[PDB]
Amino acid sequence: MTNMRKTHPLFKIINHSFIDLPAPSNISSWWNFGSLLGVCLMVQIITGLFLAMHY
Amino acid sequence: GVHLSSPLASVAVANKLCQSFQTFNISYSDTGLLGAHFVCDAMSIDDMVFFLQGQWMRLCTSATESEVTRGKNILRNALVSHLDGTTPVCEDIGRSLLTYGRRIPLAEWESRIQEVDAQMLRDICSKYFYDQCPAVAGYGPIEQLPDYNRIRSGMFWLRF
Amino acid sequence: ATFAQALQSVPETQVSILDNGLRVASEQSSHATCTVGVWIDAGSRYETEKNNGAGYFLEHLAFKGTKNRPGNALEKEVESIGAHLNAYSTREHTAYLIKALSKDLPKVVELLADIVQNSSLEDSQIEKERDVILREMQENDASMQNVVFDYLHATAFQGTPLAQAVEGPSENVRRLSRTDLTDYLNRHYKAPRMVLAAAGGVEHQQLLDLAQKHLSSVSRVYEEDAVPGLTPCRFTGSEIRHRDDALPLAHVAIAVEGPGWANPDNVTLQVANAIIGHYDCTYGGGVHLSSPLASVAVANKLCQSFQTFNISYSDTGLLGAHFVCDAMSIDDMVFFLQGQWMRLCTSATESEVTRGKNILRNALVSHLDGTTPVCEDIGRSLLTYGRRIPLAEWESRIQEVDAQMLRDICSKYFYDQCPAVAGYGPIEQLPDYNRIRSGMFWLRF
Amino acid sequence: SHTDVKVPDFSDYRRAEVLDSTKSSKESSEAR
Amino acid sequence: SSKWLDGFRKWYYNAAGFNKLGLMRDDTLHETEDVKEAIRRLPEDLYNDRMFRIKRALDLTMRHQILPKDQWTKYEEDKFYLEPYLKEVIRERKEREEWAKK
Amino acid sequence: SRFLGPRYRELARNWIPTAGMWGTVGAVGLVWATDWRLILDWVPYINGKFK
Amino acid sequence: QDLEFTKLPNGLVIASLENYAPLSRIGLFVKAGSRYEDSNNLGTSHLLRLASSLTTKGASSFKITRGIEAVGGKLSVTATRENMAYTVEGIRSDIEILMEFLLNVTTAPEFRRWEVAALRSQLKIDKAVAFQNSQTRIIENLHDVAYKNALANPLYCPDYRMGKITSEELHYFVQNHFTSARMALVGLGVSHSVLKQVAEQFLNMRGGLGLAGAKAKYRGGEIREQNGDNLVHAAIVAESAAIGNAEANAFSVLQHLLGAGPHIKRGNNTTSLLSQSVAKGSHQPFDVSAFNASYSDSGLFGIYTISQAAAAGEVINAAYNQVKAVAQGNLSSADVQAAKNKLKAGYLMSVETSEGFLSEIGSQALAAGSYMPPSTVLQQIDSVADADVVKAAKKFVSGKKSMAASGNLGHTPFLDEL
Amino acid sequence: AALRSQLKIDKAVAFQNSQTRIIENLHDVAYKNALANPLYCPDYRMGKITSEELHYFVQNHFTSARMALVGLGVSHSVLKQVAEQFLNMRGGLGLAGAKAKYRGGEIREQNGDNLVHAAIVAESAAIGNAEANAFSVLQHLLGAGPHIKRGNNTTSLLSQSVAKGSHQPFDVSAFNASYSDSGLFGIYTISQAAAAGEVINAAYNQVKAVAQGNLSSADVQAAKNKLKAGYLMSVETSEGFLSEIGSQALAAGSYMPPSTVLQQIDSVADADVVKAAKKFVSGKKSMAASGNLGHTPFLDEL
Amino acid sequence: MLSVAARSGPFAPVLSATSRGVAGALRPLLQGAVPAASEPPVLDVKRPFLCRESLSGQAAARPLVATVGLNVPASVRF
Amino acid sequence: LVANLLILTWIGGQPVEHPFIIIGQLASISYFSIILILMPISGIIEDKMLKLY
């Protein structure tokens, strides 16, 4: 038996980047804006993909 | 070695994770502490926690009749080899008359062990282990010891 | 009294020539002891692949008994007078030297002459010493840096008489007999290829008189009127790898073609080798070492040791470095050593130039302190240069070396040149020849 | 022993100016 | 005079805010290479005290709170513990730079 | 003042010819890539193609 | 010119010989060997020997290393169980700052905690490199089993003491043993005037007698290290005279009579009595010699044998029986004269190099305070008689033994069946 | 090859406590051969023990004449069948041994422990001797361990003698170890670094007083009662009973009842105890010491 | 002849320990290098004995017994 | 600085007239002066006030 999360290569990259990442415990709401920018980029990609589907 | 019948011990030998681990069931008047204590290095605490919790939930969800028979034989050997000796016999007499109010005989213990099967093991393990808030005590280089929320997330499974 | 005045106060060496052409030289000092040695132009460069170990057998068998002193009588006389008798053989030179007191000079000279010209080679001694060289070659391959130096010589001078080692192969050791040894003795032990060098409390007139007494008409005749010529040896850039992963450490030597004995650029290359330097784990310098390669090595825990060498033979040589390091740092040491070499090639600065000059001055004087190294320098200097270069002349050349000269000579001998690589041990991470050469140039000069 | 290691013949791979082992290099390395 | 400057320094020390978290000036110094050398040159007890003060400050900032006014560190009791180690590290670095320049 | 000193001055003096030759390389590459008239109508051969 | 001595009234000895050598060469000799530690500060001498390039009160570690390597000189520490020597070498032009660095290192060390904490790993590396040779292991085990308190302290720090040597212990050792009455300043190629001036203005702070070390006590016995090597090393010694004695000279003559190393490369050692006695009945390779180590408290004389695992008993018994025959009186005056000539040649060949001459003057200045010329030493060696050699061999035979053995000790004999 | 790492780990765990290393060193300096071989593999032999060496050891020492098959809770007939089915293909008496010659001497291991462990022993009787029984009675007279948790060891002569002139944590006892051909009797002291000499000298003086004859018959009877009780609680556990009957089957070849064992223990006299103490006093000494040995005395200083 | 080098010929660098704190201009023969020595295993520390009551019983009184097992911890009996 | 960025957004709002000429010019000059000159000088005097050199 092995730990698949930190054994599988893509899974261990995801785990070391986003899951088991040691983050500072005291970062305020100002540190949410990087993920907000990423989510905004994904939303823009999807919405503009549909706009170019009909544009 | 790696060919140990205990899967936690087998994976501990295979991945060289912990120095040692043991399981305890300490009982007091309508209460107790039931769980596992392990000594490991600073770079294997999360792996040992993950594997021990995975074995606990394998017992909770998918219990096997052959391994339950193995554990019953182990437990019978444990009680009788403990009760071999006058001072453990006297110790068990004192504990039995102070706790149960009577001395539970070896025949009664064997009858209860024979009553134990895989289904009620699954039910009791699901009652006491599954989705229960644990008590965690760490001493030493315990930086890799996971967060309490991660320990709770190990205490429930998303496949069951 | 400054450095130049002290160097002038170092006494001069008197050189004289006998009737047969043997060169007798001496340096007189205030020491109560002396050392006297015979240097012979003989070795692996003269051995012709059929008598490949002949000089090594003669070095073994010179002290085992002569015609005048059979058996162990020579050892008894030397140990009775209290002398230390030593011998060695490089690829070009063979030396038999005696360290003794000043009053034992006639006996030392007579014993040296008896060793040189009247060696007795009995077949029982041939067989016993054949076993002795077999055991010593086993112990030599037990040592690890000698293996790498032999591999570097073989892969750098392959197809030429400088590829073969001093000992020669084991099959040659087993098959060559007394006739081949006597042929080598009667070919390469002529009078014009011998220097009787003395250092210490020795009088030049007494040494000359004793040379006329004993070392007169040593051979003087080739017996075939066929003088062997020393042809040039072709240097080829190449790479030899003896991979054996069970060994604990890895030995890697990287060298290029050197100028030779007679070139004046040896001073500049020695200055550059002093700038790069040497290091091992015993040194307590730490991170504050002046040499950038050793500073990087102690900062990154890269190597166990490294050294820079400049080996010279007749119009050829090996100029480079050799390092002992773990299997997980060979690429880093090759990269850093090549970077230091090309930093000297391109942007060597005056501060490290004068640091290397001071290091070279201290190294030369520290080596030439002592009767045995003084005699070794006298014999080697007469065999190679034809004269004994004084320390004043060495210092004049050192002062002639400056930064622009150093970078010019380093660009001539290092920049964009094909090297010779000899790896031994766990050398998997040791880069291939293409990457080593690509490190042996820069894309920005 | 390590001295028994002989680098084999490369004359079927060497260049024309490098074939002669008696003739030295560095007057043809620039040309190559 | 010096008294007015000391009073205005006290007012700035209150206005800075790291005294409310139990920190010190050497605790709130930014970790450059020289500063990291100073922390590695610190003794064991001062290292443990500094790391615990930093941990408590991080916990207080996470909870968006401060220490009680009793437990605020005072301007007179602000120990300058990293100052000699930092000065020695700067002196050694300046010596190294001068030797590299010459 | 880290880069101001005699050793750095003479290192810079060694690196002036190489940096100048690299600047010449970049300038010649820029003219060749852009087909610059203001330079390329002075060399003898390349004058032919512009007519 | 000639060597000249002075004694500065704080107890210091200043030695100078202006021979106009191209390299000035100055050593400072301290009676601060490993014998001056006790059970609570073992390895302080090792860390002090490896701590010669640290920050000092007047020069940083970076300044010391970069200045010495910039002027091309060298700084080395040569330490034995009695003494330590701090030696600087360099051109006469840079000898002023070389003396400045040397006296700063020897007199005013900062001994910071982080620097010695970095030096501890280098200490472990140095111990492992030194024990790559089994001779050092055998000799230190021999000292440990032979002595009780003073000279039983090893030259290298113990593995348990690695990590627990403190800057306080180093400071205590330096302040208690680096004292002017226990130091000598020797220079070659330097002027006596400038040597006196630098000694005066770097040696005006410590002037006591220093901490008096305990007298060495003999215990004897055997210790064996089973390590399965093909070659068995065995040193069998006994208590001998202290250094500076006519009986010590007799012990040295006996050592060179029995064989004290090889004179001919790949020789047979045909005049060494131990080599002859072993070779009379041994066909496998061996190496037998006489070991002699004298210190101002006491001495150790015995036999060192490297042999095969199977032939170790024969080699040891043959060497011991040869020494017993010498003690009984089986020796010749020609052999004694050859031993004397070998000893004189070895002493003069030690003197003839600058390192050996500097060490000789430093040790003589420490032990006696007055220079003893080589001619008088040769005269004393000539004045050693054969009866004194017989007495020394009888002393070694009768005295109780210390054995240090290592190898495949299945056939190595013990002390009680020797 | 995979097991030799476990061999290293097992030796490290065994050498966690200092008593194992002390008594291994004690046997090493007490014997020339055949008992000075360490119970754990040496570090140089780690990585070099081979399958053919294991096979040679098994085929030379695992024979039928050097074996005893004991069983509690099984039928003698079934044990006979399994013995005749598995154990008829072994040779005979096998290799003899090397008689375990004595050497004496000492070693001292300075390792900077807070406590100094010192064992000083001498040659004694082997298994099967009334002298060995006297040595066991002498060991229980001198103190072979505590009978009371956190006790003062009132009847322990060495504990009383050390506590008479010390005020530091200490633990002194009598060490007895008999074998097929030789024995070791002596004193084991765990003391402070500064008081190690006083503790060892007090223990040795107590044993010398016992050898001179400063002992009472009541204390001898108490020692015999302690020995009888210790033997009976050793036989009490079924594992200990199996070990005892198997050791008796290997050594004597016949089973001696516990009544006979207590009878011979009672047959031990006090003059035999005095003779055993005199033998330990006059015998050559083997000393193993470890700790901070700045004040631990040597063997000639005792 | 009052020196260790002048008295012990071949035993001079064995009786003497030389370390160059600053590397010289000339390197010596046999530079030396450790062959990457291994480490003892990281293992639990035993409790100390700071009182006589806990110290009592720690003195060995019986010969060694080494017990190993398939699933029982290895024990050392004194 | 944030307030000046708000002023600059506003001035980009209304067209280029009076007094938006001088308001935008002073806003840009103050923006560059704060982000280049004023902040490091404030940091320097802040370190001096905290007694760092």
From TrEMBL, chain E:
Task: Give UniProt keywords alphabetically.
Answer: Electron transport, Membrane, Mitochondrion, Mitochondrion inner membrane, Respiratory chain, Transport
Query: Major location, coarse class?
Result: mitochondrion
Where is the protein situated, by its record's location annotation?
Answer: Mitochondrion inner membrane
Q: Name one GO biological process term.
A: mitochondrial electron transport, ubiquinol to cytochrome c
Q: Which InterPro entries match?
A: QCR7 (IPR003197), QCR7_sf (IPR036544)
GO molecular function list: protein-containing complex binding
Its assembly, as annotated, is: Component of the ubiquinol-cytochrome c oxidoreductase (cytochrome b-c1 complex, complex III, CIII), a multisubunit enzyme composed of 11 subunits. The complex is composed of 3 respiratory subunits cytochrome b, cytochrome c1 and Rieske protein UQCRFS1, 2 core protein subunits UQCRC1/QCR1 and UQCRC2/QCR2, and 6 low-molecular weight protein subunits UQCRH/QCR6, UQCRB/QCR7, UQCRQ/QCR8, UQCR10/QCR9, UQCR11/QCR10 and subunit 9, the cleavage product of Rieske protein UQCRFS1.
Purpose: Component of the ubiquinol-cytochrome c oxidoreductase, a multisubunit transmembrane complex that is part of the mitochondrial electron transport chain which drives oxidative phosphorylation.
Record-given protein name: Cytochrome b-c1 complex subunit 7
Biological source species: Mus musculus (Mouse)
Q: What gene is this protein a product of?
A: Uqcrb
